[PDB]
């Protein structure tokens, strides 16, 4: 077995292999997430609609359990591995314990997996950040994020990937009790945030959300152009009718 | 006390090339030449058994080796690497027979050994085999001739050459002979294509040949060799 | 005994340029029938079938694991398995469990994929093979079956006089065995076709 | 010859001219050590070492460079002590396993070939480094007589009549050739061992020192023992007095 | 320049262990003070965005009812050490049916000290030190106690101690304010006074964590309100 | 090509741009390091082993100074090159041989033993963790119906049988000599074979050595047991060469 | 620097820098001293404090009833070796129901710490040790270094500025063997003081003493417990 | 040891795996290979590189592999490396068939082989496989499907795509001349010879300089076949013997 130490500290106290992993995350398709009160939303930017492609076989959005799901940004292959490992842990948390998987628990698990891979011989870290979504059954709806370092925090809303810095600067200036105070408007802020950096076309997005009790729902490109018009023109009822 | 290198010694360069494999082939292109001809009723293998001094006992070692009752081999390149692969092919040949009770199909033996050669281009601590083989066999009526090189890739040839002047030795055959050639015929055009580079007095101890007809594989004796040599036999 | 837990009978016969293989259909656990439509004969390529008797679980398992191997063999080799070779393949699979064997004694019946050659054989639960030019039996009524066979089999038989011969051997043997029966099925393989009939038999 | 461009970092690498610099480098460690000598008398083998006084704070007997590897075999070392000590444990273990298996005291030639192969094992890979030490093995028995062997960092092993390792390998030999050990008795060799030590010892550079003497022969009854203080002093006096000449 | 993780510098110090001590200087600052009436721990969360839940940031955690611990540096790494600690306290309780002293707990964690390496190692073996500094505060048979531990594996007891980027400054202030006879009330005030200084951001009740452990009360993580109460006296 | 290098092709056994293995080559020079030369000749009824015995010191029990090893009672060998490596390879040969008989029921053929030792060395040639052994091995003995055999194996994996051969510093000079006398080849009797061996070594080293300056090993069809000549009877051959 | 990073690499001078570097770790540690009469073994050491609000580092540890040690160098390595030493002793009592002969324990440290100095990827232990014990051969003071080498001493001292202490000890050796405990301890405390900056000396806060002897099981003294020894100490530097 | 390890599974300052990228390079030099998705079938067409007048070639194909009974694939890159990844592909198929007694869902056989390549890039110190593969098949979940895999352990389903030499000129071409939703195995084979005639330094794209295979349904059992010499040329001539007829319109 290969025992080389891949991730090591440097003169000033840095872990380059982690910082490099973090860089791969940066070169990834933007991904934003907003935490509402009745429905949490997530949308995956730069979906490079090559058309000759096939939507289903590449959606940067996935469900882990029946009460949790996630979005990622970074090395595609890595994500797969991490996705299917959390999926497994989800069912195994039910065989050891009887109750289901929590909002945080599963996120912590993923963070622990990533952290480990930054301190084990023979391994490279995972080049992906994750936006984990889900409502705390018998409680509030939560949102969490993870980066290669293995650190994790709960966000009110957030973005990771290409230009996530921008979308983040934006999100920080649009989130309010009022802004998206209803499922109709909640799924909106994301739509705006994504677009606020998302290439022209709308055929570059792939949003979707989960209800505080219902299964998951991957929106159709139809309900897309609609909510992409309810604001495409709403971006004129104050920008073309007051400008 | 020994450990082991777990990292691979072969790795893609930016040109996308697998350097060690090319270099392995270079060891091949620099080895004694070998020719193989599929005569549609038996195959022939022959190579240049150039021994330095006369002190060498040409007998004690062979380059044309029998794998099974119906398979055979020759190489071009590093002799010691060959030997390793001969023991592994013979072994692979038995593991097949014990399970199936039928002699191993030539194509199958090639595939298996090729997999090994490929193994040594990815496993840690090792270098690719500096050799290329020419496997010949009579499996189910049709005669077969194959070649697998360092990369672990193989091909089936109607005839070919490897080693020094393999470029010229090929083109020569690329015309100096063709299908329908009967037994003894393919043998002559083979020892000839050999001389098309064989520097020196090509005698019956300067070469070694084996044939594979649909009735087993064998090595020809210095006699049958001294014969074909006189430009006939 | 373990072998007679699910009961069962299997037989193969050799004709001129054809081959037959039949099996009862009962799937029971000791005295109790559980099913009447239990498959015990499996297709292992065209003109090649394997019949498994014995313990139900291993019947299913030995068959499924054998298919696994048969498929890859055919994907690596560029052909269709030859009977004598499938026999050697099952002989290997069974003997790999020499000291904790599967409880099933297989019966192989088929025609050469590239020849007329009819072929039949049976095996040990540990993989020892047996090839004959007449017939082979396996199951809880080996004795009854040998009885019929040594009195009904004729050297050369056309597909129809083979079907009527193997069909009689079964139904009559299986009717003097309490745990075999509930219907019989027959497979007659000819270079050109595959005739599959489920005979009319007792259901007790 | 300054060869050493990567060709001297691993024991698993040959230099362009057929050398293994790591082993050679290990020997230097030995050439820098204090001299130890062994001489096969007619009724045993005698050992002497120039154990330098590292500090006056150290006890007499600290850093011994002579050990009992088996009750009938003695070991005299030079070079990196810690390396030597582990080689002494291996020697002991080897001699102990032999008795358990074949049921009799190990023949010095075998104990030597064995330990030597262990030493050699460490000169083939990058995974480990050659022992930076050399040692002599001495024994006596009536069915084998007296035997003296010497192994070095490369694994090489040979039998001697007399031999030296350390700072003054050379200087010690030219002095041993003056004796006719083949006919000499062990009781008389002690003197000569201590003699060759003072001669060779550099009064200048290397400061004060101590003398270690090992015993093994008909005089010890086959058991390798330390030389009795009495014999040591006599041999020290004789060595010192012979020095004033 | 590429060498093994277990290489010494000419100075007789392991490069990695030195390079992680460095990493701690990039962590947030935390302070721990020990009083005869209890121990308190305070740390600046160092929030980097309004959209980030200030609560989903715990630099102070419970090891066991009688022991709290504050961290600084590569927090992802501290996750592991914190767990080993909690697990250790329970193994002790399981086996001996009694609580583990604060010193023994700190020590247990310290044994994972230089437990890193490449060759001759297991598969689930660390490949580098943890870039973390820790402060174990708690109360046991020997009264209230505070211990500090860095990556070298060294640990010691302190009347008051500070770790993190502002460590140097913070410790200077702590030396000016500590009294062998002060109180848990005085202690907490100092902590926040000093923490307030060193922080680059204005001390909020939502950007700091404070907790205490006293001879009577089992570990307590100050509430958003209880912070208002103490911050009231800036 | 033309002596080119790339990467570590000069530090570990990996291919060079030309397709060569420098470490295997550096391993050959390593043989000469000992400064000795060895020769082996195949008679019609025997096989002979001869090598220098440079013992510049009088403090060594000349008895313990050898390059002649008894592998089996019917197989003897001569090592040339780095000593420790050699003893090692000798031990492996003894092992592989003792094991062959236990496992198969009959003495290992000189032919096979050499092929074995050879195969082993091949690995060091393909694996980087270790270096090849800087030594050469020559084995001799009488086969069942093949009479006397003489084999030598490389620090490169090559192995072969010869009418005669050499190794060491003067290997290339020793071959030119032998191959020239194998053409004039009189009746390859026991005496001639032994005589031809001694001279080849004496003339290439131009020494006319004493009986203590060389060692001679021999195996005979009439006495298959490997035999190492006494210093006394060695001289008996030396004198015999002086009568002319 | 091609010869500085791996303990498996000998330098062209027959030295192993990694080993030497590890030795440097000892020198850095605060000084410690050891000496024995003919009936007692004594360890004395100076403890350091990171800041004024932190406690002083442990320097003396209990191994077994008849053995104790003082450390200098990496603390984590001290704990490893200490635990090995403790384990080895527990085993002796378990199997033989007798205390592990101090010299035999020292040989084990020697063998154990030698291994890593010869294998690729491993590092020398980075700690020196002064060992004070008492077996049926009397008092003993041993020294062990990062290089698996060890020493049997009459008296000794390792650490920063330990050269002074060594010098002081070398001057009063002849006195030691016949000293009665308190006098022996004083010589120790006195030697330690040699390694300090003239403008400061022994405090009951920075001194630690370890004593084992025919009449007493290894015992450690750290704060007020050190007073009794500090009293009667001529503040007469020399 | 540390000195000779090239670190084949480490991140670069950019945040990319250089050994994966170099494998790609090797791929973009191998025999061109592509597949298009129809509604009645799916196909694979590859640049037969073992083109030479001496080879005896005794295989159903040279770059076409039968995996499942409902699947086949083709490769671009190191052939030996490919023989390894396919063998493993066949095994993953059978393990599924054994366990569930039903053909393995197409995409699933792909994610399987991908997790393995992905691994060779995260740990092990080994070099990745120098292979990119095209997968075509049918499964009762999405019927006909075409998939592509990179040595990075990455994949996607394509209605149409290409791999290998000029795997850029081939894309864009199809990317515009592709009937997204209205393709027949015939209109498919169309672009096939059209695009291969383009990206392939060959004039009058001979029948040998190519290998074709098609997968279709057919009364239950799936059918996989490689066009015979003649059957190939029909589309050869059809392309040109329609092209000169295309310039009589300009
Ligand atoms: Mg796609
Ligand atoms: Mg964000
Ligand atoms: Mg050749
Ligand atoms: Mg059929
Ligand atoms: Mg019945
Ligand atoms: Mg009934
Ligand atoms: Mg050696
Ligand atoms: Mg003298
Ligand atoms: Mg003696
Ligand atoms: Mg090598």
DSSP per-residue letters across H112-173: HHHHHHHHTTTBSSPPPP-EEEEEEEEETTTEEEEEEEETTTEEEE-SEEEESTTTTHHHHH
d(CA F96, CA F72): 11
The total domain count for chain H is 1
Extract the tokens encoding G30: 């605060």
- Sheet containing strand H41-46, strands side by side: H160-163, H33-36, H41-46, H211-216, H223-226
- In our burial notation (b when 16+ CB lie closer than 10 A, e otherwise), range D171-201 reads bbbebbeebebeebebbebbbbbbbbbbebb
With beta carbons less than 8 A apart as the criterion, state whether E92 and E101 touch. Answer: no
Selected residues 1-30 of chain A with any CB under 8 Å from a CB in chain B: 1-4
- Please give the tally of structural domains in chain B: 1
**CATH number of the domain residue C178 falls in:** 3.60.20.10
CATH of the domain at G153: 3.60.20.10
> How many other CB atoms are found less than 10 A from the CB of residue F187?
9
Do the Cβ atoms of G111 and D86 come closer than 8 Å? yes
Instruction: Say which residues have a Cβ less than 8 Å from residue F168's Cβ, sequence separation at least 6.
Output: F31, F32, F34, F36, F37, F38, F51, F52, F80, F81, F136, F174
Q: Is A88 helix (H, G, I), strand (E, B) or coil?
A: helix
Among the four given CATH numbers 1.10.10.10, 3.30.930.10, 3.60.20.10, 3.40.190.10, the one describing domain A1-243: 3.60.20.10
Look at E174 and G73 and tell me if their CB atoms are within 8 Å. Answer: no
CA–centroid distance, C159 to ligand 4, in Å, is 15
Task: Name chain B contacts of C89, Cβ cutoff 8 Å.
Answer: 99-100
CATH number assigned to the domain comprising residue B157: 3.60.20.10
> How far, in Å, from the CA of F155 to the mean position of ligand 7?
14
Are the Cβ atoms of E4 and G27 closer than 8 angstroms? no
Q: Which of C87, C116, C122 is nearest to C13 (CA)?
A: C122
Query: Closest approach of chain G CAs to the CA of D146, in angstroms?
Result: 30
Q: How many CB pairs under 8 A join F and H?
A: 6
What are the structure tokens assigned to G58, written together? 């442990």
Q: Which two tokens stand for residue E2?
A: 């590429």
Q: Is E120 on the interface with H (CB under 8 A)?
A: no
Closest CA in chain B for residue D129? B1
H123 touches chain E (CB under 8 A): no
- Whichever domain contains D106, its CATH number is 3.60.20.10
3-class DSSP assignment, residue C12: strand
Q: Find the domain containing H86 and state its range.
A: 1-250
Are residues E171 and G53 in contact, defined by beta-carbon separation less than 8 angstroms?
yes
Name the neighbours of E, counting chains with at least 3 Cβ pairs within 8 A: A, G, H
Nearest to D129 among G9, G12, G156 (CB): G9
Parallel/antiparallel/unpaired status of strands B65-66 and E143-149: unpaired
- Which H or E run contains F174? helix F171-181
Distance CA(H60)–CA(A35), nearest Å, equals: 57
- The total number of structural domains in chain G stands at 1
Residue with tokens 């050869």: H236
| Conformation bin of residue F181: beta by default, left when phi > 0, alpha when psi is -120 to 50 | alpha
Ordered by start, the domain boundaries in chain F are 1-244
Structure tokens at B101: 């009770």
Backbone torsions φ then ψ of H55, nearest 5 degrees? -65, 145
- The closest CB to that of C68, out of H67, H69, H94, belongs to H94
Place of tokens 């152009």: A225
Contact D138, D162 (CB under 8 A): no
By the 8 A CB rule, do A228 and A207 touch? no
Q: Please give, one letter per residue, the 3-state secondary structure of B194-228.
A: HHCCCCCCCCCCCEEEEEEEECEEEECCHHHHHHH
Instruction: Tell which of A119, A146, A147, A174 to mutate to test the E interface (max E CBs under 10 Å).
Output: A119
B82, B75 Cβ separation under 8 angstroms: yes
Distance CA C121, CA C135 (A): 8
State the first-to-last Cα distance of chain B, in angstroms, to the nearest integer: 59
The Cα F82–Cα F67 span in angstroms is 11
Identify the sign of the CA torsion H170, H174, H177, H182.
positive
Nearest to G123 by CA among G106, G150, G146: G146
Q: Is H52 on the interface with E (CB under 8 A)?
A: no
- Please state which CATH number belongs to domain E1-234: 3.60.20.10
Domain, as residue range, for D73:
1-245
Task: Kindly give, in sequence order, each residue whose CB lies less than 8 Å from that of residue F98, ignoring residues fewer than 6 positions away.
Answer: F72
Q: Do the two chains A and C touch, given a threshold of 8 Å on CB pairs and at least 3 pairs?
A: no
Q: How far B21 CA sits from the closest chain A CA (Å)?
A: 23
Nearest alpha carbon to residue G13 among D156, D124, D19, D27: D27
- Bridge-based pairing of strands E60-64 and A61-63 is unpaired
Touch between C and F (at least 3 CB pairs under 8 Å): no
- Which candidate, A118, A191, B196, G96, places its Cα nearest to that of E80? A118
Report CA(B137)–ligand 10 centroid distance (Å): 36
Distance of alpha carbon D202 from alpha carbon B55, whole angstroms:
57
Q: Do the bridges between strand B154-156 and strand A216-217 make them parallel or antiparallel, or are there none, so unpaired?
A: unpaired
CA geometry: angle B82, B86, B87, nearest 5 deg: 125
Closest ligand to the CA of C192: 4
Residue C203 C-alpha to ligand 6 middle, in angstroms?
A: 7
**Method underlying the structure:** X-ray
Are the beta carbons of C167 and C184 closer than 8 angstroms?
yes
The verdict on a CB contact (< 8 Å) between A157 and E124 is no
Q: What is the CATH number of the domain that holds H125?
A: 3.60.20.10
Show residues of chain A in contact with H154, CB under 8 Å.
76-77
Look at chain D and report how many structural domains it folds into. 1
In which domain, by residue range, is B33 found?
1-233
The whole-angstrom separation of Cα E123 and Cα A116 is 12
Q: Does domain F1-244 have CATH number 1.10.240.10?
A: no
Range of the domain at C132: 1-204
Taking the Cβ of residue A124 and every Cβ of chain B, the question of whether any pair is shorter than 8 Å is answered with no
Kindly state the tokens that stand for C145: 């079956």
Phi, psi of F78 (to 5 degrees): -130, 130
Q: What angle do CA A216, A140, A224 make, to 5 degrees?
A: 35
Chain A, nearest residue to H171 by Cα:
A52
């Amino acid at each position: 077995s290969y025992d080389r130490a891949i991730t090591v500290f440097s003169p000033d106290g840095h872990l380059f292999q982690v910082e490099y992993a973090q860089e791969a995350v940066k070169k990834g398709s933007t991904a934003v997430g907003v935490r509402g009160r009745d429905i949490v939303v997530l949308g995956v930017e730069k979906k490079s609609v090559a058309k000759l492609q096939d939507e289903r076989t590449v959606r940067k959005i996935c469900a882990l359990d029946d009460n949790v799901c996630m979005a990622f940004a970074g090395l595609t292959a890595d994500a797969r591995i991490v996705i299917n490992r959390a999926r497994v842990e989800c069912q195994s948390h039910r065989l050891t314990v009887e109750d289901p998987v929590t909002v945080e628990y599963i996120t912590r698990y993923i963070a622990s997996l990533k952290q480990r891979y930054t301190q084990s011989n023979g391994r490279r870290p995972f080049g992906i950040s994750a936006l984990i979504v889900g409502f705390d059954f018998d409680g509030t709806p939560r949102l969490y994020q993870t980066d290669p370092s293995g650190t994790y925090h709960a966000w009110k809303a957030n973005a990771i990937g290409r230009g996530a810095k921008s979308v983040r600067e934006f999100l920080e200036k649009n989130y309010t009790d009022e802004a998206i105070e209803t499922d109709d408007l909640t799924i909106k802020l994301v739509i705006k945030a994504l677009l606020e950096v998302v290439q022209s076309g709308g055929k570059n997005i792939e949003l979707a959300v989960m209800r505080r009790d219902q299964s998951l729902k991957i929106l159709n490109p139809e309900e897309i152009e609609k909510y992409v018009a309810e604001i495409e023109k709403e971006k004129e009822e104050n920008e073309k009718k007051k400008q | 006390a020994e450990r082991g290198y777990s990292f691979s010694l072969t790795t893609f360069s930016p040109s996308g090339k697998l350097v060690q494999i090319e270099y392995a082939l270079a060891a091949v292109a620099g080895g004694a030449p070998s020719v193989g001809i599929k005569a549609a009723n038996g195959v022939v293998l022959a190579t240049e058994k150039k021994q330095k001094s006369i002190l060498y006992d040409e007998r004690s070692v062979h380059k044309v080796e029998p794998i099974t009752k119906h398979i055979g081999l020759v190489y071009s390149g590093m002799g010691p690497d060959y030997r390793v692969l001969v023991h592994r092919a013979r072994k692979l040949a038995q593991q097949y027979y014990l399970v199936y009770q039928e002699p191993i199909p030539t194509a199958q033996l090639v595939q298996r050994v090729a997999s090994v050669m490929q193994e040594y281009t990815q496993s840690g601590g090792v270098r690719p085999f500096g050799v290329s083989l020419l496997i010949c066999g009579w499996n189910e009526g049709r005669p077969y001739l194959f070649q697998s090189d360092p990369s672990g890739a193989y091909f089936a040839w109607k005839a070919t050459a490897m080693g020094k002047n393999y470029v010229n030795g090929k083109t020569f055959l690329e015309k100096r002979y063709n299908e329908d050639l009967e037994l003894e015929d393919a043998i002559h055009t083979a020892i000839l294509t050999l001389k098309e580079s064989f520097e020196g007095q090509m005698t019956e101890d300067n070469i070694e040949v084996g044939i594979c007809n649909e009735a087993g594989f064998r090595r020809l004796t210095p006699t049958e060799v001294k014969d074909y040599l006189a430009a006939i036999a | 005994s373990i072998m007679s837990y699910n009961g069962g009978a299997v037989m193969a016969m050799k004709g001129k340029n054809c081959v037959a293989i039949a099996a009862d259909r009962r799937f029971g656990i000791q005295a109790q029938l559980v099913t009447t439509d239990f498959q015990k004969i499996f297709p292992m390529g065209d003109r090649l079938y394997i019949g498994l008797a014995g313990l139900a679980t291993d019947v299913q398992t030995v068959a499924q694991r054998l298919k696994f191997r048969l498929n890859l063999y055919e994907l690596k080799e560029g052909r269709q398995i030859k009977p004598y070779t499938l026999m050697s393949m099952v002989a290997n699979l069974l003997y790999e469990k020499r000291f904790g064997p599967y409880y099933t004694e297989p019966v192989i019946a088929g025609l050469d994929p590239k020849t007329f050659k009819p072929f039949i054989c049976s095996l040990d639960l540990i993989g020892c093979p047996m090839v004959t030019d007449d017939f082979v039996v396996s199951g809880t009524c080996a004795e009854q079956m040998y009885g019929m066979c040594e009195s009904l089999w004729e050297p050369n038989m056309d597909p129809d006089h083979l079907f009527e011969t193997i069909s009689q051997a079964m139904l009559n043997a299986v009717d003097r065995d309490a745990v075999s029966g509930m219907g019989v099925i027959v497979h007659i393989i000819e270079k050109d076709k595959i005739t599959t009939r489920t005979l009319k038999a007792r259901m007790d | 010859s300054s060869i050493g461009t990567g060709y001297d970092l691993s024991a698993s690498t040959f230099s362009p001219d057929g050398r293994v610099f790591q082993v050679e480098y290990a020997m230097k460690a030995v050439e820098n050590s204090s001299t130890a000598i062994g001489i096969r008398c007619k009724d045993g083998v005698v050992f002497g070492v120039e154990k330098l006084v590292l500090s006056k704070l150290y006890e007499e007997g600290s850093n011994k460079r002579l050990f009992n590897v088996d009750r009938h075999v003695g070991m005299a070392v030079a070079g990196l002590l810690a390396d030597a000590r582990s080689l002494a444990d291996i020697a002991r273990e080897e001699a102990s396993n032999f008795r358990s298996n074949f049921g009799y005291n190990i023949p010095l030639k075998h104990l030597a070939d064995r330990v030597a192969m262990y030493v050699h094992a460490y000169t083939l890979y990058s995974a480990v480094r050659p022992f930076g030490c050399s040692f002599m093995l001495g024994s006596y028995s009536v069915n084998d007589g007296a035997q003296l062997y010497m192994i070095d960092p490369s694994g090489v092993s040979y039998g001697y009549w007399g031999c030296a390792i350390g700072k003054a390998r050379q200087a010690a030999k030219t002095e041993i050739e003056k004796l006719q050990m083949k006919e000499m008795t062990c009781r008389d060799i002690v003197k000569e061992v201590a003699k060759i030590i003072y001669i060779v010892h550099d009064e200048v550079k290397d400061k004060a020192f101590e003398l270690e003497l090992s015993w093994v022969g008909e005089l010890t009854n086959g058991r390798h023992e330390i030389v009795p203080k009495d014999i040591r002093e006599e041999a020290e006096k004789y060595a010192k007095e012979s020095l004033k000449e | 320049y590429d060498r093994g993780v277990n290489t010494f510098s000419p100075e007789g110090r392991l490069f990695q262990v030195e390079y992680d001590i460095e990493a701690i200087k990039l962590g947030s600052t935390a302070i721990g003070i020990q009083t005869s009436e209890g121990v308190c721990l305070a740390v600046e969360k160092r929030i980097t965005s309004p959209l980030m839940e200030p609560s989903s940031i715990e630099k102070i955690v419970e090891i066991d009812a009688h022991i709290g611990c504050a961290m600084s540096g590569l927090i992802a790494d501290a996750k592991t050490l914190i767990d080993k600690a909690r697990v250790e306290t329970q193994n002790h309780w399981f086996t001996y049916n009694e609580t583990m002293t604060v010193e023994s707990v700190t020590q247990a964690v310290s044994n994972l000290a230089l437990q890193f390496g490449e060759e001759d190692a297991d598969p689930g073996a660390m490949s580098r030190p943890f870039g973390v500094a820790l402060l174990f505060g708690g109360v046991d048979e020997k009264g209230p106690q505070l211990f500090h531990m860095d990556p070298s594996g060294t640990f010691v007891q302190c009347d008051a101690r500070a770790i993190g980027s502002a460590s140097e400054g913070a410790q200077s202030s702590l030396q000016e304010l500590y009294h062998k006879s002060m109180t848990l009330k005085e202690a907490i005030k100092s902590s926040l006074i000093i923490l307030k200084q060193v922080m680059e951001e204005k001390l909020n009740a939502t950007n700091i964590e404070l907790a205490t452990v006293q001879p009577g009360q089992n570990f307590h993580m100050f509430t958003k309100e209880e912070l208002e109460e103490v911050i009231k006296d800036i | 090509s033309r002596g080119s290098s790339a990467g570590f092709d000069r530090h570990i056994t990996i291919f060079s741009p030309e397709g060569r293995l420098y470490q295997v080559e550096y391993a050959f020079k390593a043989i000469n390091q000992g400064g000795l030369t060895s020769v082996a000749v195949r008679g019609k009824d025997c096989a002979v082993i001869v090598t220098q015995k440079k013992v510049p010191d009088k403090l060594l029990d000349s008895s313990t100074v050898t390059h002649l090893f008894k592998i089996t009672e019917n197989i003897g060998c001569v090592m040339t090159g780095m000593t420790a490596d050699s003893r090692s390879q000798v031990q492996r040969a003894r092992y592989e041989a003792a094991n062959w008989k236990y496992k198969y029921g009959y003495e290992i053929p000189v032919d096979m033993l050499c092929k074995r030792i050879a195969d082993i060395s091949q690995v060091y040639t393909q694996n980087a963790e270790m270096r090849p052994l800087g030594c050469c091995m020559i084995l001799i003995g009488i086969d069942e119906e093949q009479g006397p055999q003489v084999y030598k194996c490389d620090p490169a994996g090559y192995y072969c049988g010869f009418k005669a051969t050499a190794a060491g510093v003067k290997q290339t000079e020793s071959t030119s000599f032998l191959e020239k006398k194998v053409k004039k080849k009189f009746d390859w009797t026991f005496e001639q074979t032994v005589e031809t061996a001694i001279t080849c070594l004496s003339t290439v080293l131009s020494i006319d050595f004493k009986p203590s300056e060389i060692e001679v090993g021999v195996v005979t069809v009439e006495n298959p047991k490997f035999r190492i000549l006494t210093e006394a009877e060695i001289d008996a051959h030396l004198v015999a060469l002086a009568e002319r | 620097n091609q010869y500085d990073n791996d303990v498996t690499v000998w330098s062209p001078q027959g030295r192993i820098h990694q080993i030497e570097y590890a030795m440097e770790a000892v020198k850095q540690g605060s000084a410690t001293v050891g000496l024995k009469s003919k009936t007692h073994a004594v360890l004395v050491a100076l403890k350091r404090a990171q800041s004024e609000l932190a406690a002083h580092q442990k320097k003396i540890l209990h191994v077994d009833n008849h053995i104790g040690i003082s450390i200098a160098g990496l603390t984590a390595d001290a704990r490893l070796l200490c635990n090995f030493m403790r384990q080895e002793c527990l085993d002796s009592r378990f199997v033989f129901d007798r205390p592990l002969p101090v010299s035999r324990l020292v040989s084990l440290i020697g063998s154990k710490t030698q291994i890593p100095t010869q294998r690729y990827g491993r590092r020398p232990y980075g700690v020196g040790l002064l060992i004070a014990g008492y077996d049926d051969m009397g008092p003993h003071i041993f020294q062990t270094c990062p290089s698996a080498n060890y020493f049997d001493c009459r008296a000794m001292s390792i650490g920063a500025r330990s050269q002074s202490a060594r010098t002081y000890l070398e001057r009063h050796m002849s006195e030691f063997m016949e000293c009665n405990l308190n006098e022996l301890v004083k010589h120790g405390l006195r030697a330690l003081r040699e390694t300090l900056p003239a403008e400061q000396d022994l405090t009951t806060k920075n001194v630690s003493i370890g004593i084992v002897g025919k009449d007493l099981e290894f015992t450690i003294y750290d704060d007020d417990d050190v007073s009794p020894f500090l009293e009667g100490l001529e503040e007469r530097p020399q | 040891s540390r000195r000779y390890d090239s670190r084949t599974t480490i991140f670069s300052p950019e945040g990319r795996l250089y050994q994966v990228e170099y494998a790609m390079e090797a791929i973009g030099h191998a025999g061109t290979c592509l597949g298009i998705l129809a509604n009645d079938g799916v196909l694979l067409a590859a640049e037969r590189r073992n083109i030479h007048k001496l080879l005896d070639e005794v295989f159903f194909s040279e770059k076409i592999y039968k995996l499942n009974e409902d699947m086949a694939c083709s490769v671009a890159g190191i052939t030996s490396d490919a023989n390894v990844l396919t063998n493993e592909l066949r095994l993953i198929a059978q393990r599924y068939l054994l366990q569930y007694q039903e053909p393995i869902p197409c995409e699933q056989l792909v994610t399987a082989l991908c997790d393995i390549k992905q691994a060779y890039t995260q740990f092990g110190g080994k070099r990745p496989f120098g292979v990119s593969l095209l997968y075509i098949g049918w499964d009762k979940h999405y019927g006909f499907q075409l998939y592509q895999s990179d040595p990075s352990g990455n994949y996607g389903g394509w209605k149409a795509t290409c791999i290998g030499n000029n795997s850029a000129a081939a894309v864009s071409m199809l990317k515009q001349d592709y009937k997204e939703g209205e393709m027949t195995l015939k209109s498919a084979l169309a672009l096939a010879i059209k695009v291969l005639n383009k990206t392939m330094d060959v004039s009058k794209l001979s029948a040998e300089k190519v290998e074709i295979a098609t997968l279709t349904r057919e009364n239950g059992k799936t059918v996989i076949r490689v066009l015979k010499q003649k059957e190939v040329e029909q589309l050869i001539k059809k392309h040109e013997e329609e092209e000169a007829k295309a310039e009589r319109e300009k």
